[PDB]
């Protein structure tokens, strides 16, 4: 029976995904989310596929960017685990609101 200690596979995954550039959210679900939000803002809407793709590029870049700042806020608190508290702090300093 073999078993990597907790943290090892996590760091492995960090290296893995920092090496690649592929989108990390599944395509179809994100497309559905977009159509849902848009629909709530306006019905009968159509989307160019490249527009959905742009939206996903923006969303993932923003979320990766936010997670870096979050990580810095957890490490500032002498922690290794990111928490909603951290996200909230990062977004407060960034000037984002609620």
């Amino acid at each position: 029976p073999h078993r990597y200690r907790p943290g090892t596979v996590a760091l492995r995954e960090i290296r893995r995904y920092q090496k690649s550039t592929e989108l990390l959210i599944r395509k179809l679900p994100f497309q559905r989310l977009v159509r849902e939000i848009a629909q709530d803002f306006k019905t009968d809407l159509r989307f160019q596929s490249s527009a959905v793709m742009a939206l996903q590029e923006a969303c993932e870049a923003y979320l990766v960017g936010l997670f870096e700042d979050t990580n810095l806020c957890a490490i500032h608190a002498k922690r290794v685990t990111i928490m909603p508290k951290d996200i909230q702090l990062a977004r407060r300093i960034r000037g984002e609101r609620a």
């Binding site: 090496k19 590029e57 990580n71 810095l72």
Partner: protein, 105 residues
């Protein structure tokens, strides 16, 4: 017939740049030197990020520059990183970077 680009010793299209200046609602009139200067600067900056990106491609055993190479080139260069510090490069990913406190021992 003599291309204005040629007369300026430039690859970038001086005439096109002048036209875009005229059509961009920036001023009533556009001086003849402005498009020359602007196209020159644009060409220079293009050359700089293409230089660094080409380096990234070569470092990664690649003949062809990708968005990844562009991202690495830009983020690893303080000045270009600052110039484009609020720009997002599609399919560019991020710089490998792990906070030291996250490593074993």
């Amino acid at each position: 017939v003599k291309s204005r680009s040629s007369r300026a010793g430039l690859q970038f299209p001086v005439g096109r740049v002048h036209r875009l200046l005229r059509q961009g609602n920036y001023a009533q009139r556009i001086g003849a030197g402005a498009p020359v200067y602007l196209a020159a600067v644009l060409e220079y900056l293009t050359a700089e990020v293409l230089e660094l990106a080409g380096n990234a491609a070569r470092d990664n055993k690649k003949t062809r520059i990708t968005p990844r190479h562009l991202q690495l080139a830009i983020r690893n260069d303080e000045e270009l990183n600052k110039l484009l510090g609020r720009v997002t490069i599609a399919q560019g990913g991020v710089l490998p970077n792990i906070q030291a406190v996250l490593l074993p021992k």
